[model samples]
Target chain A: VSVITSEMKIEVRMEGAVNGHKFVITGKGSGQPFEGIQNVDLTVIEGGPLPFAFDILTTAFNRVFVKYPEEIVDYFKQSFPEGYSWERSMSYEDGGICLATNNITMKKDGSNCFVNEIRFDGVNFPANGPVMQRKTVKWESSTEKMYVRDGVLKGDVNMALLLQGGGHYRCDFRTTYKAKKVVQLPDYHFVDHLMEITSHDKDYNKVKLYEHAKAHSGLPRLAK
Target chain B: VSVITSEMKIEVRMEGAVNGHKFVITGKGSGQPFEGIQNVDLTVIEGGPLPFAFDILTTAFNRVFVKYPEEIVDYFKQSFPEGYSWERSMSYEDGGICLATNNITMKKDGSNCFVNEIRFDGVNFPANGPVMQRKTVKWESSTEKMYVRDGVLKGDVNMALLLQGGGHYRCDFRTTYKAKKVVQLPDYHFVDHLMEITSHDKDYNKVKLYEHAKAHSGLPRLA
Candidate 1:
């Protein structure tokens, strides 16, 4: 007898260090991305620990670029109809859009929100000092629903830095992608996508840890 | 050479005095039909002396059934998300949506927002009111631009209350709608359909005068 599958599956992926892993998720059906994310997906990219930086988007704002991904921080407050129009020109080289948030404190003079720009230094990629290449990855709705259970897709994600010190650190990073099941949320109506980053080198465990527990609302776990 | 002719016109209509009025809106842009609201419209069949009472909406919360539309108010808080998914249906009906806002102030006794449903002496229309029977209007956007000339086609707009609940106790019910312009702020997109009710009866001119000069920033207009 052939039994029918009544439910869909969720796929997840990660890369980087324990302090700086990137978690990406994609899913189907009627669901929200993060069931009121506490340490949202992006927190993994921050050098801090898990559940440390809770969900800030859930709060009513009172002030500035006081988060990491300074550009993402700026977009949070000013990307409204009156604040800024959606720019079509800004995105990754392969049409991937980038979004970032920031949380930088003021200097000794106690003014201006500007943190030092640093490059992405990890395994399988070059060694760069400091550069400012802050951008947000635009996630399209259709792309979230796109899944291939059996296939091999080769791709690379680059990390560069352009610092105030006039430094340029660049690296050519690529990874193989094996599409997986989609994550599902019931509390709200939103979509999430996940892709396995099959690239060997440094920062692998950290990135994997982030993707695994990014949306896990319960208490975080310790890695072996 | 072809010359393009653009026409700017505004028409006002009045039937009689009414002590009450009602309005309702529905849409599906935010996942569901949103939190709370209903599909209903009400009007007055007779004219009263002054201070007309308008049955803004229907609910057991209050006897008067007075509540402004939410989408219009939300629009003022943010920019109207163009082409968002939504389906709106309403007309003097009840029992399918929710309604609550900061405007409905709480009484000192901490009772429900409403005290008692006062008796509004007026004729209620079971079908579309006088304005609805007159015209049908539709609003549209062109080439990424809203509020363009002729953006809003002709539509019916009914008035249920004029100047009501003032010291002078005299006002005309006027519900006039114009393609309202809104101010947009970042991270906060809202819609602002500017609808102004004029004080035609002259009894509640003072309130009308005040509102005309100091209008709801969301629904801006002259008296």
Candidate 2:
């Protein structure tokens, strides 16, 4: 049925691996008004003998970069042309990952919110490597549904990958999101923006593993 | 059924009225390599008395602005931070339209390819007003099916309205596009970009009225 005019939201979660590299991601929010949420749950899938190269491990870790909002990284690259530093508190069960400007270190048991740094050469980013190696990627929405559950919206997502050695992959996603900004239309309303999301895997195997919800609430609503 | 990988193309032709304003648009292309096409067939949907204000008429005409690729306009705005000029060759049965940066004039039997110019305060654009008045708008895709009718991809398009004090309106479009870039994913293959599009109305009122095709192809294929 066409959801020409109605309230809507979207939530998405995904867990899969590329060449055996595993990760989880989620994003949820509504579009009655616009806000956004993004987060990732990543881990190295263990089975076969692990590779011994730092570059290989770093490359696998770098895959997490794909799950991030491309515009965020693009903005950072634009805002700091010469290069910039980023730090995030990644608390795992036994040990945690610390990001620094020049290096990413693994720490255990401590949660004091220490800042880590990683250095980028700044010469080759977004463009230097294949699609996967690039600093940012795009998530082209493939499908969406509205009025599925009172005030919520549902949709499907598929991300494109252009890897080195001329390899290509399509990452599919399932989403359920809550709306703060949704304007109904003729055959369907537009989910202009989202505020919170509960992303899931295509099979709905993992729940809330990758979570992101905006902190502030009470965004202005569109006129009915 | 999911199309893991396949060749495709897209062509879109539109004829509709927004609160009485009428227009048409089309695009066609392929990804085996890459080239793009875009064109517009726009006019006024009659019946009621037309507005008299030049600003209002121009504003309605400018609504066609949304159909154009936003990045193209944004590039121009950035290139000419101060202002810029624009003009097109619109040949129709009775008359055609001439766009002069600030105003769009409908002229009769214009054969010459003249580039008319327009002025932009650059203060209010892409964000000047809601929905119709904005420099750019989004066409939310509703449905998509691949490998249909001998390898063509089909889908439904819906655009929202934020015009006339913000009441909601949905403009539906039927599209058949060929894909030059389709990547196979888990459940299905993703059609990355369209080289051409043939957009039509739900009722099939207008056909191939607007046509645009780009030349000089061969964009590196996405792996």
Candidate 3:
């Protein structure tokens, strides 16, 4: 889903046709002059020329805690560049509602970089520091489902998030992704946007993402 | 939103309430386990403690086109560490439609920092040598308006675009800004949601934001 900013006095929409492999974006700028614009027609078409920008196609791949301004992969790419093997750790403590220290592992299959095995250490609530329970996206099995188009690497990851109260949301995250590249603008050379797509309620898939922790992570406790 | 990727499967609806700053977050999680999350009750209240995180409140203040993942001021705080000073280049481009380069100058007023020198060099269309015509947010300056609060700097910028077919668009863009830091997983911290927000008809303001290029930029062609 491509959307204009929420605060704009006007709006522009970008919607994709996964089957058509096309996107039809149309929006009217302010039709008045004092408002600074007029007699306008704004419609942009992506794909057909170049595959949709990696940012757009990544509607398939989305992340929870962000891997921002700089991608986690890029840092690793430079660290490994050739050998390409690495792991970075992340910890989570939500008002103590939940506690977790996760280890994220990154690997390379040629130029396609991905995080396969994730190390997780969470709640015992002192639930006894109850440190043993985990789930992985089976990307190894999903590789048949992964492929690359143009410069973008397309694949699916079983991305799941654990909640504060209970339950974890397991998602079949899919997307076409690319690392940051500098594109020269009319006036400036800017870093192209990475993942402009935000998944709103209706903006997401037909699949509803409502779940509990026990399913994948195994057994919830009033223990918290 | 790609909310599906969100770790905190449920929503802790943060609608503002003055029962001293309460968030009315509501949404269902996976109703089935294999489906993922279910019967979620995650409502958080902020107050009686400290002000809400500088993140959400930043929206009360907004930015132009992009919000850098790093705080320019943090660097300022580091460089000056004491009385640091600075300016940075910020540009605007919408879907590769419009492009601009601008200088954002930061200064201090006791403890608050406001970037006032905000004007953009748009119309560099043809993406060629950029020179000439500009616009700012009316930010105590000629183009945009800049507002800063807490660690957040919010402002209004006049964004104008030239269409491919030929025409123009003047947009008054508004938003809040902050250094991008990952707050736990409901993942609302990133302005990435801007793209997810779908605006049809007039999710727009009453005074429609419809305009053309020639007006402010000067006479057009076909001449």
Q: Candidate 2 chain A: worst 10 consecutive residues by lDDT?
A: A118-127
- Rank order by TM-score, top first? 3, 2, 1
In order, the Cα lDDT scores of the candidates are 0.20, 0.23, 0.23
Candidate 1 DockQ score?
0.01
- The sequence of per-residue lDDT tens digits that candidate 1 reaches over residues B1-223 is 1011111111111222121222222111100112221122222223332332222221111101112243233322121111111111112221111111111112343222211211111222212332223221211111111121122211112222222221121112111112123432122112222223222233321211101011112334665
Off by over 4 Å in 1: A1-137, A140-215, A218-224, B1-8, B11-223
Of the candidates numbered 1 and 2, which has the greater TM-score value? 2
Q: Can you write out model 3's per-residue Cα lDDT over B1-223, one digit (the tens) per residue?
A: 1111112222212233211122233222222211222232222333323222211111121122222233222211222102211111122242111111122222333322223221111111111211112121111112334444334434345544343334443434443333333211111222221111111122111111111110022134567
How well does each candidate superpose onto the true structure, as a TM-score?
A: 0.15, 0.19, 0.20
lDDT of 1: 0.20
Docking class of 3: incorrect
lDDT of 2 by residue, B68-109 (tens): 232222111121112122211111111111111222221222
Scoring only the A-chain of each prediction against the true A-chain gives TM-scores of 0.22, 0.23, 0.20
